[PDB]
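Design a sequence for this backbone.
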């Protein structure tokens, strides 16, 4: 039993809710919140900008030190950093950004990072300002992630479409 509330169950291990991931993280304090990161960990907008704003920019400060030491992530890759006031840990995962021309096949590699964590609160990777079809992202999630994932979808209209079209 865990504290996630109000989710629709899609499969054995994937759950979905119309929610603001920032507000959901603030209430649940999950072990892991996933950030929709880029390779530079520049948290300017979308989910990343919102998560970073909620940490009062502490996420960005920590991320800049990470990059200065380690260099950029790979598209499809991830790193574990602090969850600050939102979660124990933040798993920064880089899905391909279609608006930069990155290969959508890398979306499966991106979701594979979730399998290193037993339970996660997450957005749909490569959705929103990353330009991919969220219906496709949900399909890849379900077919790739084997651990327990709680997906927060900010847009109510999109949430209803994802549910109604789910196979
Ligand atoms: C066109 C459009 C607008 C928004 C989005 C994306 C994808 C859709 C499918 C879900 C919501 N989205 C997020 O990025 C998101 N999700 C959860 N919590 C968030 N908090 C701040 C942003 C945010 O796409």
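Sequence:
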């Amino acid at each position: 039993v865990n504290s996630f509330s109000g989710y629709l169950k899609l499969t054995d291990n994937v759950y979905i809710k119309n929610a603001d991931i920032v507000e959901e993280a603030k209430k649940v304090k999950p072990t892991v919140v996933v950030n929709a990161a880029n390779v530079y960990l520049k948290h300017g907008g979308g989910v990343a900008g919102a998560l970073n704003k909620a940490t009062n920019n502490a996420m960005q400060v920590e991320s800049d030190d990470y990059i200065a030491t380690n260099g950029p992530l790979k598209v499809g890759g991830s790193c574990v950093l602090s969850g600050h006031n939102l979660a124990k840990h933040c798993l920064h995962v880089v899905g391909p950004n279609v608006n930069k021309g990155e290969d959508i096949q890398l979306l499966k590699s991106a979701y594979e990072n979730f399998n290193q964590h037993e339970v996660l609160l997450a957005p749909l990777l490569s959705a929103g300002i990353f330009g991919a079809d969220p219906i496709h992202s949900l399909r890849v999630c379900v077919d790739t992630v084997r651990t327990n994932v709680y997906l927060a979808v900010f847009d109510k209209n999109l949430y209803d479409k994802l549910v109604s079209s789910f196979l």
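The chain has one domain: 8-165.
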